[PDB]
């Protein structure tokens, strides 16, 4: 995602936003899957 995020021409914010949105979502999903999701997978699961 991040390499193709390197936009260009009039297709700038196009591929840009369409990438970095999902990249941000990715890093956040990962942190959540390393903080929130594990803790909830603990606590109460079974």
């Amino acid at each position: 995602f991040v390499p193709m995020a390197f936009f260009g021409g009039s297709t700038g914010a196009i591929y840009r936003q369409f990438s970095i949105t999902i990249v941000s979502a990715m890093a956040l999903s990962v942190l959540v899957a390393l903080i929130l999701t594990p803790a909830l997978c603990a606590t109460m699961l079974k």
Partner: protein
């Protein structure tokens, strides 16, 4: 001019004087009925929907002072498409939430276990809103399809 016999030459006498249009080049007809309106051109790097909402704002405080008959009409508008875009996208988001809840249920028998992924991704979604805002972005047609696709 005042002629030799003392007769005056008024402008009225040499020219038809009427309170007329400054320009007779263009004429607008709304549904065959004579009319005139405001064709607002956007500014480069403007806020779009904010600008339109504020157009409605400034135009709102004129309606009470209008003369008899003077009525507003709205042809060529962009707002409902934006609103319905947001609507039809968020709707898809929710549909994906429920449809992932059902798959999470028709695989994990436990009702308490199928809550975790249902709780996880709304958090992840909101964080993205915080990031895009902190990066200078906004709710866009690409930054919503991006959300739905990233789900």
């Amino acid at each position: 001019k005042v002629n030799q016999d003392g007769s005056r030459v008024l402008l009225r006498d040499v020219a038809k004087i009427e309170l007329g249009g400054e320009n007779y080049d263009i004429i607008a007809e709304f549904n065959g009925q004579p009319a005139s309106g405001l064709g607002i051109k956007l500014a480069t790097g403007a806020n779009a929907l904010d600008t339109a909402a504020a157009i409605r704002a400034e135009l709102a405080k004129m309606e009470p002072f209008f003369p008899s008959g003077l009525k507003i009409v709205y042809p060529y508008d962009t707002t409902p498409f934006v609103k319905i875009s947001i609507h039809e996208v968020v709707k898809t988001l929710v549909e994906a939430i429920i449809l992932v809840f059902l798959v999470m249920y028709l695989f994990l028998q436990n009702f308490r276990a199928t809550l975790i992924p249902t709780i996880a991704v709304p958090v992840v979604l909101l964080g993205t809103f915080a990031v895009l805002a902190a990066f200078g972005f906004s709710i866009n047609t690409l930054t919503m399809f991006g959300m739905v696709l990233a789900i």
